[PDB]
């Protein structure tokens, strides 16, 4: 059936893309947004979400829920609001799809148990890019056969952290499967400090930062006589959208909370 | 427990590698070979398999089986011999791992049924390179999320067929999942014939042939704002060996016939 | 000294980038544009170039030249106007940098001779992307050492022509150096038509068309035991800008007409 | 004319390839080797260079020179012998091509001056792989246009040094052209030590070590909206041979000493 979607935080960089995605998906209708602005935001610099009869703007989620009764709520707001949003949806027969981290352990347990008792789907997706998540999922399967692996991630030269969050998560996922070991000859020595990169559980990770690049990762699996590589290249925030689409479709089909798209792709 | 292995066709390019692999695997012992030479093979050009007490040479498989009672028979002989070999093993409590094609439909059905009734493992592996098979397996999973794909395969410049067998199999595997469609703008036109490549069920396939190269494949999955690529590079026949190893280990654990390592990785 | 630049066709996709480039380059000042609109262009859909005192809009180039006396005129207009523009600049001590093709043989000869007699620089740049032009220039140098080469170009799936103009030019440039020969085993045969691609003077060219991609080319040089690859990836029209910048800087230094940035990088 | 070649150190890994190369080159004849064995080398483990009338074995270079009068001497011996060899050739009208380092500054100056006065060619080639040297040469040209660059080198997992000698030389060559600067955001911070790699004059260098790999390097040049990459992959010591071939051909044509094939490709 049609899926009636409300979006929290439509004006964010991700939010703007999600709006366009939901509006363009044949089987989805954007029916409301949860939104509010900084009290000092000049309209000339920081416009309102555009006024329409078809997509009313609410300040309060309870009110949105009771008035619009969306099937799904896509939360692209902030870590400090996700728990209260999720619980509110789950108690009102709305499936929440949450696009940021921020739950405590205890908070997540409460949402998980509530989803299960209500037999209502919930997806928490710290990464919506299906290509990035498949990359990670497949890497952790591959690591059963090729325990020697390196990760190379590349981003634009304004990025403040190295390695990337994606690279860290990737290494964590591999390390669930791959026996812990270091790599490289036991007696190798760097003659220029840092050449071998960082190490997560023995997995080398290298971080490239150059103008021009957006977000890119390769995972290299070595073995006798061969190399098996997984690679993801993201050129813009549309890379996230097939994950938004999949999440909204799939939340309607499941009856429990799933954390991480790797657990359902 | 230790796995006692006999190899048919030890002197082949693949056979030579398989010999070394089995001899070097901690939990395996090479206990016999099935071998024979062309009556015109001068020893100076085409040496005998090297004489040893530990690895006796048999001309007849029945005799090898009764005398040596191997756990596993690794068949690297020819398509015209695989069926008779497989049946003989299956009736004598030997697990056959077959490394070439050549069964008829009817032949395969007979081996499958016999394996099942005897509760004895059999693996038929048209491709032993785990990296190549993972590539294909993962591609067919990925194609559920990214229906637009191209295959680029690259080989040395002595190769007679284009596209490669691997590329064909890859396209067949993808096409099980991917809805049939052509790709590229409906009105595109080649101004130099062939630029867009070959097409298998709408999937473009491109074949590179250059000195220097060995055997290489990339699978490119496009979607909005991103590219997800799987790649395998083989530099020599050791690329096959982890598949030989996995097959020998795994045949001991299963109680039926499996055709294609994608069905058990 | 500062370089005072006027741009013809500021509202084009390329023009818009060139405007931003010139405005942001420390040693350049945008002093005028040559521009005019379709008589049916509603302002609401097709806005005017934005009004400013610093960048006056002219309809007639002669008038721009006499009034503003720019050092350089960057022509991003159309093939049918480039010759008249170039000649007008060259006769008025303005260095023209022309960013589209469209000269006849006879037309180009006239501009070349006039530039030489006036000792005034002119650059005609059919491709402003320095990375793409270096790729081509280096490929033609490499082809002296590695005569066996293939070209793989990849674009978005709205592109109408295969192969790309860049791929064609690349093949033409290589073919100046590389002895003419076909590649691949003499007896190879395609079992799926088109797998080996198109051929330009024996050079195979393959064309990939996928959503997600922008504009990409790899040139693969094979030889014994090795592969040497040149690759260019363009994610947006800023890829062109370092070529615009280089052309404007370099036209001031030369005293003759140069056709193709490969001839001066 | 035919080029009559003698090789010093024919039994080395490189030497063996050079022997095959010279023997297979149409315009070259292998006419002698300079060779000797360790006094403890059992013939069963460490065979003699194979006896032939066409390729006599000498222990002393002076004797080889006077007896055989080769056109070219290819020195694949050791750093402690190259100077004495080079001088001896240069004084006897033999062109030396030297395939290992080991000269002092003063030693090289003596050979350079002697070559120049005798108008006799000499090539010193610390790297014979033309694809690797072109990569480096082209990188240093590219760095004039794209000052932001990173180097990724990849080798097998038995390699003791990181980064590679090739990567170091590459960085040195780039740094002749590229203005010295660091890259990445000024405030970036590693949260896992080493992620950003090593730095040579601000150029990041990353070192991958995996089974399967042989010797591989990519050089990534970033700029607005684009990436320009140079890559070399070596699968065996034949990668060196086109450089041996080029060096022997080119030494006959030059009348002075050239150090590094980048200076003559
Ligand atoms: O994994 C990450 O940290 C990541 C992913 C996409 C973009 C960026 C970024 O631009 O910083 N960072
Ligand atoms: O898929 C194939 O056809 C294939 C695989 C490995 C090597 C070769 C070959 O060398 O021909 N061909
Ligand atoms: O070489 C070409 O033809 C080319 C270059 C950049 C973009 C495009 C395109 O988008 O069509 N085509
Ligand atoms: O640049 C180098 O250091 C290099 C080049 C080729 C091979 C190797 C190696 O195997 O160590 N190292």
Author numbering:
A (entry chain A), B (entry chain A), C (entry chain A), D (entry chain A): 0 to 264
The authors write:
DHDP reductase (DHDPR; dapB) is a branching enzyme associated with two described pathways and that reduces DHDP to tetrahydroDPA using NAD(P)H as a cofactor. To address these issues, we determined the structure and characterized the biochemical properties of DHDPR from the psychrophilic bacterium Paenisporosarcina sp. TG-14 (PaDHDPR) isolated from sediment-laden, stratified basal ice from Taylor glacier, McMurdo dry valley, Antarctica29. The results of isothermal titration calorimetry (ITC) and enzyme activity assays demonstrated that PaDHDPR has a strong preference for NADPH as a cofactor.
Electron density corresponding to DPA was observed in the substrate-binding site of the C-terminal domain. Structural superposition of apo and DPA-bound PaDHDPR revealed that the two conformations were highly similar, with a root-mean-square deviation of 0.54 Å (over 244 Cα atoms). This suggests that DPA alone cannot induce domain closure of PaDHDPR. The apo and DPA-bound forms of PaDHDPR were in an open state, whereas the DPA/NADPH-bound enzyme was in a closed state.
